[PDB]
């Protein structure tokens, strides 16, 4: 790509999310930076409307897979960077087992030198005293493999995967993710062979921050392609 060239160094990131879950309206803003060469990013998120009405871990996947490290032998399979700078639309349905559903639409693109993720999230049918609206989820995350496939009649990619959030009573809350990404612009993109993204996330708190917030460190490497060396 020349989309690839845009990620050779450290890139500033801005994330803005506008949310509505059972009529609770909220906003989140995140800032930090990404380094695709090492598949690493660092971000701090603030709930700008006050107290966040859902648990922070439930928003992680919604809150820039263009910062994945693709190994050399797999560069031909990186849709996310090939869509830059014009970007891509990322849509999900996140279905919480025995509870509500989030639907998300985001545009991920450059605005000047900053990579921007701008999201709208709508959440419906949540149980007012279930694990989500009742804040019964632990503050932690885990590592996941996200399987990527080429959209079979169209010009983007797809992914489905399960996130498992720990609940405070020792159980797990499932969040089944269905994802589609499609380019904003018109010019050629890379359509990948089947592979996956090996993802790891660590959450923390800033001892000096008294707003409702999440600090996040993430490492993401692509894997699972046998051919393309030398």
From TrEMBL:
Keyword Nucleus found: no
Record keywords: Chromophore, Luminescence, Photoprotein
Pfam families: GFP
Superkingdom of the organism of origin: Eukaryota
Keyword DNA-binding: no
GO biological process, one term: bioluminescence
Family, similarity comment: Belongs to the GFP family.
Name of the molecule in the record: Green fluorescent protein
Organism: Aequorea victoria (Water jellyfish)
Species lineage: Eukaryota, Metazoa, Cnidaria, Hydrozoa, Hydroidolina
